[PDB]
Design a protein around this ligand. Structure first.
Ligand SMILES: Cc1cc2nc3c(=O)[nH]c(=O)nc-3n(C[C@H](O)[C@H](O)[C@H](O)COP(=O)(O)OP(=O)(O)OC[C@H]3O[C@@H](n4cnc5c(N)ncnc54)[C@H](O)[C@@H]3O)c2cc1C
Ligand SMILES: Cc1cc2nc3c(=O)[nH]c(=O)nc-3n(C[C@H](O)[C@H](O)[C@H](O)COP(=O)(O)OP(=O)(O)OC[C@H]3O[C@@H](n4cnc5c(N)ncnc54)[C@H](O)[C@@H]3O)c2cc1C
Lengths: 481, 472
C-alpha cells in the first residue's frame, strides 16, 4: 500500500502529490502527511533523498571530514600533540566505504520516515497529465494515475554541462564522479571555483592530488560571498597547496593517448593562451533546474530564462493548485532552502501563513577552515546604498581556537550605522557552519549587535569570537583583541 | 609614590582582567593587581585552558590509537603517546594566552601591579610583593575579583604528588596505572576522561547519585554516564570516601562506603584526584577590618550593581554567588564597570550556559526537568537523537540527543539540554534563544544550514512545539 513500484498500477487518490524526494520534496511530503493530507511522493531514482543525500551534501561532507582527519594524522598536527605514528597510509576504498555507509543509512531512513508517516511512495517518473492528475511511468513500462487536489513540483537540479567537454565520469567527471574516484589523481583540474568545486578540490588536495581550480570570475566561493572573506579564504587555501587561476576561461579539453587531459585556457577577457595538463578533470561550473518531461509546456507553465518555474509567495505556479519549491525555483540552490520552502508551502496548503526571509538563509563551505555567512555582504550593502559599520574578531585571539592550534580566519559583523541592527554575519574559520545558525536566529528577531554582545556565551568556545565581533561593531572595541 | 586610580581590580582571572580592560575602555584610570607570576587566574593557568587542551589532545590520541581512524581508511602501524610533548602543547597554549592578557593590558593602558593586594582603607589598596616591598594605590573604587581555590577534603591532605587537585592532575609526568577521582562533577569527569583515554584505569567515586554536578538534567546525566562507562570510565555513585592513606610504597589506600552507610571497602591507586568542589578565595584581603562579612559559604554578598555594603567596593566572579564559571565572571565584570559608569546592569543567570568538554560533550542552559517539577511549572518535552542528524551520521559520531523543555501555555523555551557532538558550541545558540525569550516554534522556523548538528536543536524545538519532528 505505502510502496507503489513496478506492477502496482491501480489508480490512486491524494490530497497532495509531491514529485521528487530531495530535501524539498521528502520533507514537504512528511509534513503534509503530519498536517493530515493524504500524501503521495513520486521518485524516479532507486533511492529517496535526491541530490543532497545521494550525490551531494552527504557524501561530500563525509569525504571532507575524513580527508581533514587524514591531513591531521599525516601532516604536522598530530605530532605536535604527542601522538607519534610510524607510517600514515591512505586506504581510499575504506574511506569511500565510510562515505557509502552514511548515504545508505540516511536514504533508508527516509524510507522509514515515509512509512512511519503513511506517505505513499510511488517509484516512477511523474508527469503532470492534467490540472489534477499525475501519471507515473515505471521501470517496466507500466503507468499509474494519481488523481490529486494539489501538486507540488520538487524535481530539483542537474549538473550544468560545459559545451564541447563531455562528462563521462571516468577521467572527465562531474561532482558525482569526483565523489567516487578509485584512486587519488596525481593532478586534477577543477573548472569552477564555486562552493562545490572548492570543497571537492580540497578533498583531493588533502589526499595527495595536485589541484588547480580555473574560474571565469574574479573570486572563489560563488555568488554573494563577501569579497574580503573570499580573498582571505583563497589565500588560506593557496597556503594549503590549492592553486587558483581566476579571471580565466576554459576553451576546450582533449583526452590524450597517455590517458591524461590537456585543458586549453586563456584570460577571461582574451589572450594569454595556455595549456594545463591533468589526470582527472572535474567540471563544476554550475547546476540548473530539472523539469524534463514534466508536462509544463502542455499545462502552459512557462519557465524563466534560467529554467526556473516562476512561483508566488505561496509557491503557487500560475496554475493555483500546482506548486513548486527548491532547486527548481529561484533563490539559492541549497538543501535547507528547499526544505524550508517545502514546509511553508504545505503549511500554506493547510491554511497557514507563508513567509520566508531569504535574507536569513545561511550559506556554508565545509572546507577547513569553514566559511559561512548569512544576510548581506559589504558589496551588497554598498550596492543598496545602506550605511553600515564593521566589527571583526580574529580566531587567533579566541581561546578555544588557540588552545586547539586552529586559528585561521575571523568573524566579521556588518551593522547598520545608526541603528546597530545586524545586517550580515560572515565567518571564516573553525566551526563556521554551526556558528552561522546563531546568526540566523539573531537575524530572525531583527537583533542588534548590542543584543548579541549581551548574550552570555560559554567560555572557551569559538562562539565567543562571534560575540566579540558584535561587541566591536556595537561599542567600537572588543575585549580580547 | 602612591598610584592614584579610578578603579583598582584585585585579581586577573576572567572576571578581573576583563573588568580591568573594560573599565579602561570606559575611560577609568585602571589598575589590576595580581599576586601570581602570570595573569589570567584559575581559568588560564590551572583551569579551563589546560583542561581543554588535554581533552582535545587525548581525544585525538584515542581516535588514532583506537578504532576510529582505521574505520575512515586512515591506517597507522604504531600509535604511541609522547606525554611530554602532549603536555608541551598544553603549556604552549597557556603561555600564549597569558602573554596575550599582558599585551591587552598594555594596549588598553591598564596598569599591572604584581603583588598580594590588601584593602587598607575605604579608598586604598596596598600590594605587597614577594620581597616585602609595597605599592600603595589610592583609588575611588575597588573591584574584588579574587576568585576561587580548591575545596579541601577533610582528613585528606593534597600534596600535588600522589594526592592531587585539578592542578596536579593537569601536569602528571606519567600516565598513572590506576587513578581514583573523588567527585564526579564537571572537573572530575573531564580530568578522569583525559587520563582514562591515555591508558589509566580510572574510577570516579561520587557521594550523590548522578554525574556532572549541580543542575544537570537527570536524563542527560544518566545517558552521559552510560556512554562514559562504555568507554571504560568506571563510577561508584552513592559512595562516600572516609579517608585515604599515603603508603610507604608510594601508593594510596582509599576507604569508601555506601553514601548512606555500610559496605566498607578499600581500593588502592597510584594517584588520587580530589575534586569535590571549589570555594571563594578572600584570604587576607582586609574584609574583616572593613566590616565586610561573608555569607555562610564564604561568598561576598553584593547588590545588583555588584557593590558590597561599602558602595565603592565591589565584587564579581567566583567570589560571589552564582555559577562558578569563567563566562559568568567575565559578564559580571563587564556589567559591574558599565554600572560604575552609570549604565544599566542586568544578568539573567538562567541564561548562563554550562559545558562539559568530554567526548561526547554536554551542554545546557535554563532549567532541568527536575527544576521545573520542583517549581511546579507545567511543561512539554521535545527530543531529537543525533543518530537521526545528517551531519552527525555523516561524521559517524552519533551519540546522544537534544532535549527541549517548553512552557505548556506559552510555548516559551524553558531549558535546552544537549548530549553529543558539538554541544559546547550549540548551547550558545540556545543561550541567545533564552535571552530573547524565544518560543520553541520560533526556533523550529529558523532556517538552519543543512547538514549541521544544530538541525538537531531545530528539530527538538519542532517536536516540543508541534508534537513531531520531521526526521525522527
Ligand atoms: C556535490 C554537491 C554538494 C552539495 N552540498 C550541499 C551542502 O553542503 N549544503 C546544501 O545546503 N546544499 C548542498 N548541495 C545542494 C543540494 O544538494 C540541493 O540544493 C538540494 O538537493 C536541492 O533539493 P531539491 O529537493 O530541490 O532537489 P533534488 O535534491 O535535486 O531532488 C530532486 C529529486 O526529484 C527527482 N525527480 C526529478 N524529476 C522527477 C520526475 N519527473 N518524477 C519523479 N522524480 C523526479 C530526482 O530524481 C531527485 O531525486 C550540494 C550539491 C552538490 C551537487
Ligand atoms: C580544572 C578547571 C577547569 C575549569 N574549566 C572551566 C571551563 O571549561 N569553563 C568555565 O567557564 N569555567 C571553568 N572553570 C572555572 C573557572 O576557572 C572559574 O570560574 C574562573 O576562573 C573564575 O574567574 P575569577 O576571575 O572569578 O577568578 P580566578 O580565575 O580564580 O582568578 C582570581 C585571581 O585573583 C588572584 N588573587 C586572589 N587574591 C588576590 C590578592 N589578594 N591579591 C592579588 N591577586 C589575588 C589569584 O591569584 C587569581 O589569579 C574551571 C576550573 C578548573 C579548576
Amino acid at each position: 500500500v505505502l510502496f507503489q513500484g513496478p506492477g502496482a498500477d491501480q489508480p490512486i487518490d491524494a490530497d497532495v502529490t509531491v514529485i521528487g524526494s530531495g530535501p524539498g520534496g521528502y520533507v514537504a511530503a512528511i509534513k503534509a502527511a503530519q498536517l493530515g493530507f493524504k500524501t503521495v511522493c513520486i521518485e524516479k531514482n532507486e533511492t529517496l533523498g535526491g541530490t543532497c543525500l545521494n550525490v551531494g551534501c552527504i557524501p561530500s561532507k563525509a569525504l571532507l571530514n575524513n580527508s581533514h582527519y587524514y591531513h591531521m594524522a599525516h601532516g604536522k598536527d598530530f605530532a605536535s600533540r604527542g601522538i607519534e605514528m610510524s607510517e600514515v597510509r591512505l586506504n581510499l576504498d575504506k574511506m569511500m566505504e565510510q562515505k557509502s555507509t552514511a548515504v545508505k543509512a540516511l536514504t533508508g531512513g527516509i524510507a522509514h520516515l515515509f512509512k512511519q508517516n503513511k506517505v505513499v511512495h510511488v517509484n516512477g517518473y511523474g508527469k503532470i497529465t492534467g490540472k489534477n492528475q499525475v501519471t507515473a511511468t515505471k521501470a517496466d513500462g507500466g503507468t499509474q494515475v494519481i488523481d490529486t487536489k494539489n501538486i507540488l513540483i520538487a524535481t530539483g537540479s542537474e549538473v550544468t554541462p560545459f559545451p564541447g567537454i563531455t562528462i563521462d565520469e571516468d577521467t572527465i567527471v562531474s561532482s558525482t564522479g569526483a565523489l567516487s574516484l578509485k584512486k587519488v589523481p596525481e593532478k586534477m583540474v577543477v573548472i569552477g571555483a564555486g562552493v562545490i568545486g572548492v570543497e571537492l578540490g580540497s578533498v583531493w588536495q588533502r589526499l595527495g592530488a595536485d589541484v588547480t581550480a580555473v574560474e571565469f570570475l574574479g573570486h572563489v566561493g560563488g555568488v554573494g560571498i563577501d569579497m574580503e572573506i573570499s580573498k582571505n579564504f583563497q589565500r588560506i587555501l593557496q597556503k594549503q597547496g590549492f592553486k587558483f587561476k581566476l579571471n580565466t576561461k576554459v576553451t576546450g579539453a582533449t583526452k590524450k593517448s597517455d590517458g591524461k587531459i590537456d585543458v586549453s585556457i586563456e584570460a577571461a577577457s582574451g589572450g594569454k593562451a595556455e595549456v594545463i595538463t591533468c589526470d582527472v578533470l572535474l567540471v563544476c561550473i554550475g547546476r540548473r533546474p530539472f523539469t524534463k518531461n514534466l508536462g509544463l509546456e502542455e499545462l502552459g507553465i512557462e519557465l524563466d530564462p534560467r529554467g526556473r518555474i516562476p512561483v508566488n509567495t505561496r509557491f503557487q505556479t500560475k496554475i493555483p493548485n500546482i506548486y513548486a519549491i527548491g532547486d527548481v525555483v529561484a533563490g539559492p540552490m541549497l538543501a535547507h532552502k528547499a526544505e524550508d520552502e517545502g514546509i511553508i508551502c504545505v503549511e500554506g496548503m493547510a491554511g497557514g501563513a507563508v513567509h520566508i526571509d531569504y535574507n536569513c538563509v545561511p550559506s556554508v563551505i565545509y572546507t577547513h577552515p569553514e566559511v559561512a555567512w548569512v544576510g548581506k555582504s559589504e558589496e551588497q550593502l554598498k550596492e543598496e546604498g545602506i550605511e553600515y559599520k564593521v566589527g571583526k574578531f580574529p580566531f587567533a585571539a579566541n581561546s578555544r581556537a588557540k588552545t586547539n592550534a586552529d586559528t585561521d580566519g575571523m568573524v566579521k559583523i556588518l551593522g547598520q550605522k545608526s541603528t546597530d541592527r545586524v545586517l550580515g554575519a560572515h565567518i571564516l574559520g573553525p566551526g563556521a557552519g554551526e556558528m552561522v545558525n546563531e546568526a540566523a536566529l539573531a537575524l530572525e528577531y531583527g537583533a542588534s549587535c548590542e543584543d548579541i554582545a549581551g548574550v552570555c556565551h560559554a567560555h572557551p568556545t569559538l562562539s565567543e569570537a562571534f560575540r566579540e565581533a558584535n561587541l566591536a561593531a556595537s561599542f567600537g572595541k572588543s575585549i580580547n583583541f
